[PDB]
Design a protein around this ligand. Structure first.
Ligand code: 41J
Ligand code: 41J
Ligand code: 41J
Ligand code: 41J
Ligand code: 41J
Ligand code: CL
Ligand code: CL
Ligand code: CL
Ligand code: CL
Lengths: 210, 213, 209, 207, 212
């Protein structure tokens, strides 16, 4: 037990203190970031301001060579945990939020020996959404885009594993029931510039539960 | 006066020895799992909002664990058997409500108690908004709501989450609350995910309550 | 320039050259004296049974490690320090419903006898049923204050008086105060022989006419 | 010019010991004035009123003096308010923490004078009864040091007229008058005077 | 091999600019700084006629250039730009002059630095400011204005400019409660009777009404 602890501390020291740390992606060395949503609750829909409040888990995954190790050199440790503040994390942002996002989970990432990092902040988000039709069978439809704030598609290649939002943990007694929820990778161009810009469009269709 | 300076010097030396001169706990591993014992003392149901299905609780969340790296012999430190430390200066478990709707608001100073056997006691008072349908709260049968607590990033092979009792402590519940408590339980649950052989642990806090009359 | 240099030297001597107070122990208990000056009952919410008070919380304690001879420091008898740079007691409301909001600069007064005076102005929401507030008899509410992590053998919590100071109470508040008391209470827990101390603030109030 | 500015700041902040605050032997004059921008809200259910104002604070320190000839003719600079001593001037009857609206930056001039002007939103205790009438409502709030007497911080004003020249013309509330009056008080315990500036605002619903 | 090399060069560059060099201490009269400012208005969220406050969501584009942030890409593996936390560089103290609550930041506080020493910083923000929404429920709509400028620097220290006087409405939320009739951003030069120096602000004027 002392041995496994000593190995973990040595590993973390080797990656965080003895090695220079990831400065972020470049055009020459682009980073793939995979993004997916698990929608937990539509808490509130405000038709006086056209803001809707969601609670979701935002799953982020990327992989770095600088975070790789051989478990045989570190007492068979295959993974560890680190504060999200102590590693580089992608600047993925909602583009149409109306209040700062509120974080609901401890800011801790999972690092595996292949260099892959898994970071899953639970969040409450207020975003721009007209809930007209929410009190009808057809329901309301709203959308919000997520993407890097400062990196193009040539620097952060943003991807999804599926276009289906995970609804398996959606709160069964929410005020709003979900008719559908999709997450679609979109490529966008700006007329100034040849590089592509990537976002993931979260489209949610919902109505008042009855 | 002389003894008093001595006891102070010993406390400072102890804290220095544990926090500055020793490497500090990096968290649990599969080879070295940590038992964390969890219990709730429910103080008040402040608010039940049927327009959003959120309920607000005030409770004390008792957390206890034990580390070898925090052990000392009181005889080597002027018979000091315990001390206090800021929660920011030690490792603490990442226990989280799984269905909160707003960041938890902390109501107490973030200070932990460390004893010479290496056991740590940390008891944040908290206000929590969580997902809850209060339908039936204005009836005799009352409303029932539930919220799970557990580690965000550690399985049952890394943090073994336990309770001392399945009864929520109601002995400090606010007697003039808007809501009276019919029952409150805290149940350790073990769960498996089909991807993975390891067990995942949570503590399910189930509260049954109604408007006071 | 002489008086400034002496103040800086004094603060350097107490804060930088000396090891600082690690907190009280069973062998070296600390007396903390507590008193309230109630300024306003801002709000009483009968839909949630929360009441909001604005008060000044007077805290006083004394440390040997903060003593000095004024003759060795140009006749300086007192100074000011940020509350973050000294130890302060962890006195807490036991039945608050929101984090306390601080209204005053977090500065303490240190006198040459080693006594420290710290008086945060605060807004507090706490658990309170305001039923009867719209009547002659009024509503009664209570909230306890005490250390979060220290027993009576470590922090001996005291009051100078059991009367809450109402001499600054806001004369055009929505609520008038019928009475306000602050009572030291001693409590035992069945696990443990040590006493636990709190100060119970009891306020009786009604809607003004 | 940039090298000289950096050298000056280094000389004042890093190479010199910094101002520990005023003493009885070395009292500090702090001059205070208000520019009232808006009465945002008047809440008669809680008797709280919300103001937006600029709070002008000025003082002078020998330890912040320099000769511009020794620093490439630099006569002034800017510094974060966190990197210098600032006075603990406080509203005595606020009901919520003050919200700061401007960057916390002070202006330091070569004579050692410091100018610090935080824009603030303040909720304070105020009965707005009469606000819906011609006579209007009257409210008051005192400002002063929290921990220094008049023998340590000598609090002054330049004028007793609140500056209303930037008052928001389409506010919900119009200002009938606004004054800022230095008051001296004695407490029976103590011989030292205690100073505050009483901000009295008379206002009514527009128009 | 190249990938390790490009990473090493980025780290060396950042170390050279942030650790081995002193920070820009801010502008002076002898060395004034041009700051270019522009707005992209995303939403009028709320108009409160009981307090005369309006809430906007916008992106505030800020650009300036510093010699101390220049480098030759040939000396750093052809790196032409990088990203940095806004806390690690000097940023201009541009402020709304008639806000009623602290601005709420909606984007990560990261700036873009290019090898010519130019810095681009674009905080997304929610702002409450003083605004009478009377006429918002009519065809002519309501008109409100808010000035932006340096809090502590004159026109001889920060020369505040715009690239256009048209607010960018191309991302305005199509299902907002309020539709925008017009939105302009006008550089103004102000003289104060105390002082010969000019004071510069950018006046954001928005005309809007309830969507029908
Ligand atoms: C819903 C609309 C949005 C609009 C913004 C968008 O961004 C800008 C300028 C941007 C467009 C794309 C090309 C360019 C040119 C250089 C560069 O500068 C930005 C970062 C990346 C970089 C260095 O390549 C600089 C930067 C920090 C951008 C932050 C804002 C955005 N970031 C993500 C992504 C990069 C944009 C596409 C979309 C955008 C957020 C959503 O990108 O500039 C500015 C704002 C005001 C809007 O009008 C648009 O136009
Ligand atoms: C109410 C539903 C909840 C669902 C989440 C749950 O967690 C995930 C993936 C997770 C399931 C269990 C197996 C696995 C595989 C590796 C690992 O990764 C997470 C940390 C622990 C580790 C290393 O063993 C990585 C991590 C940071 C998990 C955060 C989320 C959760 N954490 C606590 C606990 C670990 C889960 C059971 C429950 C869960 C919070 C409540 O766990 O992955 C993701 C989210 C989106 C949900 O769909 C589920 O599925
Ligand atoms: C209105 C009811 C309240 C109940 C709490 C109370 O505290 C606990 C356990 C506590 C009772 C007294 C004996 C003991 C044993 C060791 C010790 O542990 C606490 C700190 C002091 C120490 C080391 O002596 C550990 C600690 C950090 C206590 C924080 C909580 C409280 N602190 C102040 C004071 C110390 C208690 C009396 C009262 C209490 C806040 C008010 O105290 O344990 C836990 C909570 C959940 C409640 O059920 C009770 O019981
Ligand atoms: C509207 C009523 C207010 C009442 C307070 C006032 O302050 C106290 C005690 C105070 C009265 C004046 C004399 C004395 C004696 C020593 C000293 O202690 C304070 C700081 C200055 C010092 C060292 O000279 C210690 C300190 C930190 C005081 C903070 C509170 C105030 N500060 C500013 C100014 C100093 C006071 C006049 C007014 C007061 C804020 C407004 O001042 O003590 C306590 C509180 C509870 C009230 O009842 C009164 O009485
Ligand atoms: C909508 C009205 C506003 C009014 C303010 C304005 O500023 C003051 C004094 C100011 C006017 C211009 C000349 C002068 C003289 C020296 C100097 O002092 C300020 C910083 C710049 C400096 C050193 O040149 C000192 C400082 C920190 C100013 C902060 C306030 C403002 N700053 C930006 C800009 C500098 C002003 C024009 C406008 C102003 C914010 C908007 O500027 O003083 C004070 C306040 C109370 C108002 O009455 C006016 O008058
Ligand atoms: Cl990293
Ligand atoms: Cl630890
Ligand atoms: Cl101390
Ligand atoms: Cl810089």
């Amino acid at each position: 037990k002392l041995h496994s602890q000593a190995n973990l501390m040595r590993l973390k020291s080797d990656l965080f203190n003895r090695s220079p740390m990831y400065p972020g992606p470049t055009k020459d060395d682009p980073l793939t970031v995979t993004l997916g949503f698990t929608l937990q609750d539509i808490v509130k829909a405000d038709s006086s301001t056209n803001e809707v409040d969601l609670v979701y888990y935002e799953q982020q995954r990327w992989k770095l060579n600088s975070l790789m190790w051989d478990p045989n050199e570190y007492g068979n440790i295959t993974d560890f945990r680190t504060s999200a503040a102590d590693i580089w994390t992608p600047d993925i942002t909602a583009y149409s939020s109306t209040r700062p996002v509120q974080v609901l989970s401890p800011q801790i990432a999972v690092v595996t020996h292949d260099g892959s990092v898994m970071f899953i902040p639970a969040q409450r988000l207020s975003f721009m959404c007209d809930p007209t039709g929410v009190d009808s069978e057809e329901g309301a439809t709203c959308a919000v885009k997520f993407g890097s704030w400062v990196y193009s598609g040539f620097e952060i290649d943003l991807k999804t594993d599926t276009d289906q939002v995970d609804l398996s943990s959606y709160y069964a007694s929410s005020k709003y029931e979900i008719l559908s929820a999709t997450q679609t990778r979109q490529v966008q161009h700006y007329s100034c510039c040849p590089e592509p810009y990537i976002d993931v469009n979260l489209v949610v269709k919902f109505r008042e539960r009855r």
